[PDB]
Amino acid sequence: KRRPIRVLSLFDGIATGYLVLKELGIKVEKYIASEVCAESIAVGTVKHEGQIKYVDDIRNITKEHIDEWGPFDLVIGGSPCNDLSCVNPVRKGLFEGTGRLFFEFYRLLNYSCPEEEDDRPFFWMFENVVAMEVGDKRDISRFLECNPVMIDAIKVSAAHRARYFWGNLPGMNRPVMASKNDKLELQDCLEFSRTAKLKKVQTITTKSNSIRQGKNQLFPVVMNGKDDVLWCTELERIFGFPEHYTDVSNMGRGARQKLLGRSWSVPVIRHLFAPLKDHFACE
Amino acid sequence: KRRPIRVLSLFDGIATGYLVLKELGIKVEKYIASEVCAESIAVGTVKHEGQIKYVDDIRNITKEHIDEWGPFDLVIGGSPCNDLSCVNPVRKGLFEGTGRLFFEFYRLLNYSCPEEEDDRPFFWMFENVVAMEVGDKRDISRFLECNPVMIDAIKVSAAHRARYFWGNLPGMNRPVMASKNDKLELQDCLEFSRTAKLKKVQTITTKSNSIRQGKNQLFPVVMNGKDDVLWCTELERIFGFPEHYTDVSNMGRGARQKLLGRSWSVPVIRHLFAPLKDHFACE
Amino acid sequence: TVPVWRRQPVRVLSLFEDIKKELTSLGFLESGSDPGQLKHVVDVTDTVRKDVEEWGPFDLVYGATPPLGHTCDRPPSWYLFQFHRLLQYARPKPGSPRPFFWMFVDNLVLNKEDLDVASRFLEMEPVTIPDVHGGSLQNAVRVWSNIPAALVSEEELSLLAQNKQSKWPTKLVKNCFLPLREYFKYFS
Amino acid sequence: TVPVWRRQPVRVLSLFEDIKKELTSLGFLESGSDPGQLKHVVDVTDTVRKDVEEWGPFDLVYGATPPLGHTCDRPPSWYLFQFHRLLQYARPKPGSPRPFFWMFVDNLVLNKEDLDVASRFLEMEPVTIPDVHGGSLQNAVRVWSNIPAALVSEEELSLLAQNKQSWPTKLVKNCFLPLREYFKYFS
DNA sequence: CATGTGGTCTAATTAGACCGCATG
DNA sequence: CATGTGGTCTAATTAGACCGCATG
Ligand SMILES: Nc1ncnc2c1ncn2[C@@H]1O[C@H](CSCC[C@H](N)C(=O)O)[C@@H](O)[C@H]1O
Ligand SMILES: Nc1ncnc2c1ncn2[C@@H]1O[C@H](CSCC[C@H](N)C(=O)O)[C@@H](O)[C@H]1O
């Protein structure tokens, strides 16, 4: 009947995809990831017990690699948004610098895409920021031949995260509803003795200034009467990752907030991956 | 007929004594800790659900404080050894620097000792290093009126940790044995895909060079071909602490290693605290 | 192969530079043709696959990086990526095989990393056509193409591009269009 | 208080310094007694509680820190800590109520930190006794004691201890004096 | 002879202040 | 007008190199 799912993960980072597929019961046969930061590779290799195959730089994978490693049923991707987000002033755009890496994703997608005679199921998803210039968005849409759906994590987590998602998954525009296990408020993610001055927080970048909310940059936590910033475990709880999911490779708060700031929201990707349980085998 | 235990922990640090008592199933009515390092207090407060009372510096604790907070059934102590150990070339001895803090223990101990009419059981324990000058050990024994038992943690863990223990606990001289859960080799404490070059590890301190074993300063773990230092979770496994027990307060690697290098060995203190189940109420 | 009387007039799609004035010199286009077997579009940012399919079937797709200095609100990589997109839009169905060709030429506008992304997205190494006059090279192009169409080092080309910042070399590439005479009809 | 014919000679234990030739000069010990009912040990490093208990029951224990010309083999705090450790041995059982006294005197060799440690371990603030000659202080001492026995600011004492770095038993004998109402007065 | 609940000094390493403007 | 999957620069901040000698 139903068969396990074969995934090709692009700019995988901390392997949020595999984690969602696992938490969903979907049985995974292959999970080929392309990642270059050794810390993220360590996260993925430890927290999933070496079930993920890593393929290194995206610009060194050929069509022969896609055919041999293939066939693939799912292709996830989220390219670097360093030259695309409008928070960086020196941003170079989609056709210069990090943005160009998007065209690698594209290049592989049409490689792994089934031919016009093969009616096999094949799914794909690409994610990037909303805070990009409209030209970058329209060009990404043109190359993907799809218009995006904008999802903010504030409906399912305790933080804002407006992100654009292109793809063909079932019901990508279906209404987003919250689950009973989702921590909607900041207090639901905090630790003992800590109090949330806020109920929802802003978007969390890889930088420290994002952890201080408001135009006046206020601290979010109060502990023993003092103003304190968020802890790493609470960031993991906000994003939806399991607790101590990023506690590897002797990483301090810098590398951990960096890896989490480039990542996805676990409940959002759970929502977007949920319909796949009807096409593929479930554990 | 057994009653919950009432504890007084001077220099509590990572609150190892509470962890050991609650792992042995002993009901604790009162646990008063005297710690100054805010990060240690954070570990103890978060990981034990605020069931611990902190009373700041031991030098500001008066006999009236002992009478108010008391009476006490257990006294626990481990004073700073930076001026007692021989690894420090600028050690100041037992009567200068941090060594003087030992005499605070002594003081509070005499404040908490029951009257001779009180047949109520009263237990106490003091821990310090083996690598101290013979005069300092002599004087500690003189002031405590008993000789110490020497215990190395290699019999129950994967690292060397030679420590002197003064006290009157039942059977402190009985032979030490390793339970099934005692991770004896270094490979048992390592993460996925990381292999141990050594079967046992040298004595781990707050300083980083303690991780580099041998006169050649050889790394103890290899991964993907290259040598690497021990991770914080692996250190927590070595000392017997639960995983991510010290993952609080946005602490980097150095702070965690400091905290763990000052603390005790969990299985050693479990061995020492096991007899108290026969006198006090178990869960 | 196709016989002479069954050869059809070729239908081409020029993507950045107009080769009409040059292909009409090789007898692939009639000087007067309101049907316009060549489709030329210069700003392809708003082009959808349905536009390419509605414009009609194409036998050839041509693109070129703007000649040195003649740039405008676009990097060199933009032309390569857009050419790849539109070529994928125009490539015929594999189950309906037909003579199909494409070409992309650079006038030393792409640097080394752009050269690598070009060779990766076009799946072949370029050929370097030189213009040697008086024993000295004056201009040069790089061509990626699937048509079965003098040696000099990369240092000479680098110094040539360095000096020639202070222009279209269509004559060099024209020969590369000659092999197309056997598949499509030849005007007088 | 106790009647005079029932007053007994006081058994005293002098630590670090010797109060003989001073208390005997006051009338608490006879000069001829070879045992002298006084115990004196200068190096208390290897003294056990059983040693103190065997050395006889004591009515008074005394300790003093060596003056600016100290033995300087031990820190000034060693004398205080060892005095505490031994006094805790020499005290009588609660069920044996008896007149028991103690005294520790510092000759300005302790630092303010060690002063606080001393006041913490001895459970009281000291009393500074001054030697005033020609309206000018010459020497002074600090005394902790439980015996029911001229004002100077700590800056005079600070500059004094600073200059005099280049034994005021007389100042302390007055503090011993109130012990007459409990023990025998020798002629 | 090897080792060690370390301290100091200096070279990296990191983190906070600063800046930035296109889109709702 | 508030905001933002960021880069730069520089002041703290941290970590590795160095040193150290009393005891089984
Ligand atoms: N050339 C390249 N090849 C492969 N991965 C690359 C790359 N350049 C950057 N990356 C990786 O691409 C990632 C983009 S950040 C996106 C991470 C992912 N969305 C998540 O949820 O974790 C980064 O982790 C970066 O290390
Ligand atoms: N004056 C003081 N009062 C109380 N605690 C103090 C102190 N000076 C130092 N300390 C604390 O005493 C601890 C000694 S290290 C021993 C830690 C503890 N035995 C454990 O097993 O975790 C240190 O953590 C230090 O922060």
Numbering used by the authors:
A (entry chain A), B (entry chain D): 458 to 740
C (entry chain B): 181 to 329, 336 to 352, 358 to 379
D (entry chain C): 181 to 329, 336 to 352, 359 to 379
The authors write:
The establishment of DNA methylation in mammals is mainly orchestrated by three paralogs of DNA methyltransferases (DNMTs): DNMT3A, DNMT3B, and DNMT3C, and an enzymatically inactive regulator DNMT3L. De novo DNA methyltransferase DNMT3C is required for silencing evolutionarily young transposons during mice spermatogenesis. In contrast, DNMT3C forms a methyltransferase complex with DNMT3L to exclusively methylate and silence evolutionally young yet transcriptionally active transposons, such as L1, EVKs, and IAPs, in the male germline. Among these, DNMT3C was evolutionarily derived from tandem duplication of DNMT3B but lacks a corresponding N-terminal Proline-Tryptophan-Tryptophan-Proline (PWWP) domain.
